[PDB]
Amino acid sequence: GTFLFTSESVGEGHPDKICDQISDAVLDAHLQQDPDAKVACETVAKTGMILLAGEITSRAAVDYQKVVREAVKHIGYDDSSKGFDYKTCNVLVALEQQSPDIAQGVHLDRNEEDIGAGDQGLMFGYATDETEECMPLTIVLAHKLNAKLAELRRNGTLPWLRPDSKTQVTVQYMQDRGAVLPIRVHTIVISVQHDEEVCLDEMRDALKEKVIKAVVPAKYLDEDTIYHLQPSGRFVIGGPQGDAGLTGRKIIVDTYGGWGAHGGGAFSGKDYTKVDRSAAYAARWVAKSLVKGGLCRRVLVQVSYAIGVSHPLSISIFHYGTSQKSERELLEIVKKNFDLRPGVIVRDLDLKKPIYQRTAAYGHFGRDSFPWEVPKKLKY
Amino acid sequence: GTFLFTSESVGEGHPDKICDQISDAVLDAHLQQDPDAKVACETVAKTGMILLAGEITSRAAVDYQKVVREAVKHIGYDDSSKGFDYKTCNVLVALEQQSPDIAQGVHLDRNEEDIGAGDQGLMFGYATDETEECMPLTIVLAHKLNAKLAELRRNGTLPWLRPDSKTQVTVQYMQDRGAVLPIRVHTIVISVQHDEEVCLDEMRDALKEKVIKAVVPAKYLDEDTIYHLQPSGRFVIGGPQGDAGLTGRKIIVDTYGGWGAHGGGAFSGKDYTKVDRSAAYAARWVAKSLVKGGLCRRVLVQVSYAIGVSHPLSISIFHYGTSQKSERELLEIVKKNFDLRPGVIVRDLDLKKPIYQRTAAYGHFGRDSFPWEVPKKLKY
Numbered sequence A, B: 001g002t003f004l005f006t007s008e009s010v011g012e013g014h015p016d017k018i019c020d021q022i023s024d025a026v027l028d029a030h031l032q033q034d035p036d037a038k039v040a041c042e043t044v045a046k047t048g049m050i051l052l053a054g055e056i057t058s059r060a061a062v063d064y065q066k067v068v069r070e071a072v073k074h075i076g077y078d079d080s081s082k083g084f085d086y087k088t089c090n091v092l093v094a095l096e097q098q099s100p101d102i103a104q105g106v107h108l109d110r111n112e113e114d115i116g117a118g119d120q121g122l123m124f125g126y127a128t129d130e131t132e133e134c135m136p137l138t139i140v141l142a143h144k145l146n147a148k149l150a151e152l153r154r155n156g157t158l159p160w161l162r163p164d165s166k167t168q169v170t171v172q173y174m175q176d177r178g179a180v181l182p183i184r185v186h187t188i189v190i191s192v193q194h195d196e197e198v199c200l201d202e203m204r205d206a207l208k209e210k211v212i213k214a215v216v217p218a219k220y221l222d223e224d225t226i227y228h229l230q231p232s233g234r235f236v237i238g239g240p241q242g243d244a245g246l247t248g249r250k251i252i253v254d255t256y257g258g259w260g261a262h263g264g265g266a267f268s269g270k271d272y273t274k275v276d277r278s279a280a281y282a283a284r285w286v287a288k289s290l291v292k293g294g295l296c297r298r299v300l301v302q303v304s305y306a307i308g309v310s311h312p313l314s315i316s317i318f319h320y321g322t323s324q325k326s327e328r329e330l331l332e333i334v335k336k337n338f339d340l341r342p343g344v345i346v347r348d349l350d351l352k353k354p355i356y357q358r359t360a361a362y363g364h365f366g367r368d369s370f371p372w373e374v375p376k377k378l379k380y
C-alpha cells in the first residue's frame, strides 16, 4: 500500500519566479492607485533584460522602471558578479490597453457582482489533511528548503549562495482509505547558484547540515534517504543568464506540486476578473473548507467558465473516497454555501487588495492566512 | 454516480499556441542540420512582435527571420487587417549559447545512453480507455472543434474566420469501477476571432451547424445542451494584438485537459535532453501501453529526475482501481519493460527527428501514431 510522490519548488531568484514576482509587483502598483485596474502583465527575463508585455487599462500612473528594479533588488540580484543587477539591467515595456472587444464583453456597463468571467477556462482546488495547512507534504518541504536557502543567503551564514535555486522532495506515503499518510523522505534534490570560490564538498556539507536538517524533521530522514545536492556539479551561471524566465511557467509550484490537477492558467500579473487566478483561489477555499469542516480528508474541486458569463459552467467534487457523503451530496453543499461568480469572489476574498507580490514565491496556498486559506463555516 | 468534467483547447492562431509552434519550428530547423542540437527556445508574441529568447548550442546555421515568418504564414496571419502579418512583423532575437555549467553537468563527455537529465522535475503520463486513442473525450472534442474552425477558414467556407480560437467542452460522465463513461455533452464554448462585417447571428448559426454538428456526435447533444457561442459578443481584435502569447502557457491543452496531473514543464522549444518533454512523452507511452495491454482501464504515471542524473529518482503508478493487479505489481511490470533514462528514451521514441512543430497544436497525445502513441508489448 505504499507509493512514492515527488514535488518541486524554486527560489525567489529562479528566472521564471522572478517574472511572476515582477508581474505581481506591477499588478500591486496599479491596484494601490486604481482598485479596478485591468491588468494582464507578462514578464520575460533573459541576460540583462526584463521585458513587460501585455495589456493594462488603469487610472494609475506607474513607473515601470522603478517597480521592476525594486522587485529585482528585493530578490537579491544586485551585481554583475551574480549574473544580474537591478541597477543596470535593461527594462523594456510593450504594454497596451486591454482590448476594447474584451472589455465590452466582460465588464463594461455591468454590475460588479454580475461581471462576466474575463476568459473561458477550467480551474482546480485541492486540499489534503496530511498537514495542518491542508497541503501536500512534498511541496511544503520543497518550498521550505528554498526559503531556508534565501534566509541563509540574506543573513550572511552562507554568503556563497545566490538567488536562483530549485529543490525537489520525494516522499514515501501509505494509502489510508483514500487519504495519504507520509512515512519518510525518499529523495531530496537541491540545486542552487553559487559563487566561483566555494567547492562542491563545502556546499554539499552545508546543504545537508544547515539546510535540510534545519527544515526536514529527522523522523523522515534515515540511512536510505537519497541526497542529490548540487548534482550538476557546478552552478555559477544562473538567474536569467543561465535560463530564460517567463511569467506563468511555474504553475505547479504555485499550486499543488503534482497532486490534484491544474486547468492551465497562470496566476501572476492578473487582476480578479481573470478567473484563472480568482476562481483557482476560490476553488482552494472551497476545498480547504470541506476538509477543515470535517466533510472529507482529501478533495479536488473543478470549476469552469465562459468569457462574458458570470456563473460557472460546471462545478465538480472528487473526494477520493474520503467522505461518508457522496460526491453529489458534497456538490450540493458547495452550491448552497459558495457563489463562484468572479464579482462575488472579489468581495469574499478581498481581491482588489495589493497583496499579490506576496503570493508569487513559495506557493499561493497553504501560507499566511490569506482569505482563501480561512475556511468558510458550512451550513448543511 | 454522474459528474461533469470540462476541458479546453485552442487554435493554431491562439497567441500562446503561435509561440509553441514557432519554438518548435526553431527546434526542427536546428535538428534538420544537427541532430544533437541543444535547444531551449522561448517565444513571446505581442502586437507586431515575435521575440525569441533562450539558449541554443548547435552546429546548424538557422535563419530565424525566415523560420519565424514561415511559421506565422502557415498559421494564417498574413495581413494587417487580421491583426498580424508574417511579412511585416518585427522578429527580435535574444538567443545565447547553452550555459557551459549546464552542459558540463548534463552531457559533456558522457555516453549518450548515460547522459544526465537536462533538469530536475516531475512528469506525468495518463491514459483512459474511454476513447480508442486513449484520451479524455472532453479534450478530444475540444481539439477537433478548433481543427474544424481552421479547416473551414482555410477552405473558404467561412471566410470571416480568423486564426485565433478557443473551445471548451463539458461532458457528463458515469463512474464505472474507476473508469469513466461519457454520457452527453453538457456545455460547449466556442470563441473565434472574426472579421468586422459578419454579424453575431450569422456566426452563432454557423458555429452550431457547420462546426459543432460536424464534430460532435448527435448522440451526445440534446435539448439540454448549453451553447456559449461567441459569448463575448465581439472578437475582431485577436491574435497577439488581443493578448500576449508565450511558449509553455498551454501545458494542459498540450496534455490531458485537466485529467490526470501535470508536473509543470513545457514541451515546445526543447530538445530530448530536457526531460520535461522526453519523459512526459515516455510516461504517456507507458500509460498507453498499460491500457492497450489490458492491464488497466485508466492510469496515471509519475516519474521524476535530478539534473545530471540519468535514471529517474521515482516512478509511481495510480490505476484508479481499474486493474486486478496492485499498483505495486504494475510498477514492477513498468520497471521490467521500460528504461526511462533520457539517453534511452531518445532511441525508443526517435526524439532527434524534426517532427516537433507537428506536435505544437491540437495536443501532443492521442494523434498521428507518433512513437509514444504506439504501445509497447509488455512482458510479465
Ligand SMILES: C[S@@+](CC[C@H](N)C(=O)[O-])C[C@H]1O[C@@H](n2cnc3c(N)ncnc32)[C@H](O)[C@@H]1O
Pocket: A014, A015, A016, A164, A165, A166, A191, A192, A232, A233, A234, A235, A236, A237, A238, A239, A242, A243, A244, B039, B040, B055, B056, B098, B099, B101, B102, B105, B118, B119, B120, B307
Ligand atoms: C537547467 S535550466 C533549463 C535548461 C536550460 N534552458 C538549457 O539551456 O539547458 C532550468 C533551471 O535550472 C537551474 N539551473 C541553471 N543552471 C544550472 C546548473 N548549472 N546546475 C543546476 N541547475 C541549474 C535554474 O534554476 C534554471 O532556471
Ligand SMILES: C[S@@+](CC[C@H](N)C(=O)[O-])C[C@H]1O[C@@H](n2cnc3c(N)ncnc32)[C@H](O)[C@@H]1O
Pocket: A039, A040, A055, A056, A098, A099, A101, A102, A105, A118, A119, A120, A307, B014, B015, B016, B164, B165, B166, B191, B192, B232, B233, B234, B235, B236, B237, B238, B239, B242, B243, B244
Ligand atoms: C480573453 S484573452 C485573456 C485576458 C486578456 N489578457 C485581457 O487583457 O483581458 C485570452 C484569449 O481569449 C481569446 N480572446 C481574445 N479576445 C477575445 C474576445 N474579444 N472575445 C473572446 N475571446 C477573446 C484569445 O484566444 C486570447 O488569447
Ligand SMILES: [Cl-]
Pocket: A016, B119
Ligand atoms: Cl525551470
Ligand SMILES: [Cl-]
Pocket: A119, B016
Ligand atoms: Cl489564453
